[PDB]
Amino acid sequence: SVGLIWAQSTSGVIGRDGGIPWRLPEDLAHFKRLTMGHTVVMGRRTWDSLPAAHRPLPGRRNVVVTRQTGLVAHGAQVVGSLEQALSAETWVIGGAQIYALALPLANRCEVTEVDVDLPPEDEDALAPVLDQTWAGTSGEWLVSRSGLRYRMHSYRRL
Ligand SMILES: NC(=O)c1ccc[n+]([C@@H]2O[C@H](COP(=O)([O-])OP(=O)(O)OC[C@H]3O[C@@H](n4cnc5c(N)ncnc54)[C@H](OP(=O)(O)O)[C@@H]3O)[C@@H](O)[C@H]2O)c1
Ligand SMILES: CCc1nc(N)nc(N)c1OCCCOc1cccc(C[C@@H](C(=O)O)C(F)F)c1
Ligand SMILES: [Br-]
Ligand SMILES: [Br-]
């Protein structure tokens, strides 16, 4: 059982300049709560993007997907394909390249939509596009303690 989890702007941006272009504490809490105790699978660029005090992600088996040989990723397992990463509950935590690999294998997507305007730029990482084979249920728009508006969506494959 494979799930994808990501946070996107309304425009579909998930990443810019090797990072995430907003801060939303409620999303980090949501991400930690859903992934804790489970394997998390990430692309090598997303491993690099984790703040050092949170890398590897504590309380979870971290798996890093790379085409490199002998990659040093302390505290993580390093695999050469998504299939190697997947051999109870496994969460694919990004980025865009690894989402694209994982989406055909997933039965579940947990999406945070963040109501910031961020027109997609050339090298932005973008969220996967979900068609009508996915059934979504959405929370209401919520206002964070910091004033940002956001909404949680849960998708299951029909
Ligand atoms: N908002 C969110 O929810 C969210 C979540 C995660 C990440 N992000 C953001 O997204 C960005 C990173 O995403 P990204 O798409 O640039 O990178 P990414 O998917 O995290 O990682 C790309 C790397 O994965 C490896 N890879 C890709 N395809 C592979 C394959 N078929 N077999 C083996 N290895 C493969 C390669 O590693 P090597 O180059 O080492 O060979 C490649 O450079 C950052 O800005 C990050 O902050 C946002
Ligand atoms: C957290 C942003 C996010 N959001 C959803 N919804 N999906 C995702 N794929 C995702 O990206 C996962 C890759 C980036 O991850 C982190 C970035 C900064 C800090 C942490 C540590 C975090 C934890 O310990 O989990 C703690 F702050 F709670 C993780
Ligand atoms: Br962040
Ligand atoms: Br934060």
CB 154 within 8 A of CB 57: no
Ligand 1 mutation target, pool 34, 54, 67, most atoms within 8 A of CB: 67
**Per-state percent for the chain, helix, strand, coil, to nearest 5:** 20, 35, 45
Q: How far is the CA of 115 from the centre of ligand 2 (A)?
A: 18
Q: Method of determination?
A: X-ray
Q: How far apart are CA 125 and CA 14, in angstroms?
A: 6
Read off the tokens for 121: 């730029």
Read off the tokens for 84: 């190697």
From the list 105, 104, 85, the residue with the least C-alpha distance to 40 is: 85
Rg (CA), the chain: 15
Ligand 1 atom having least distance to the Cα of 68: 41
Q: Residue of the nearest CA to atom 24 in ligand 1?
A: 43
Q: Is 86 in the pocket of ligand 2 (CB under 6 A)?
A: no
CB 3 within 8 A of CB 98: no
Say whether 98 counts as a known binding-site residue.
yes
From the list 61, 22, 14, 21, the residue with the least C-alpha distance to 41 is: 61
CB 92 within 8 A of CB 38: no
CB 27 within 8 A of CB 142: no
H helix or E strand, kind and range, residue 36 = none
CB 82 within 8 A of CB 41: yes
Q: How far apart are CA 87 and CA 152, in angstroms?
A: 29
Q: Is 46 in the pocket of ligand 2 (CB under 6 A)?
A: yes
Say whether 84 counts as a known binding-site residue.
no
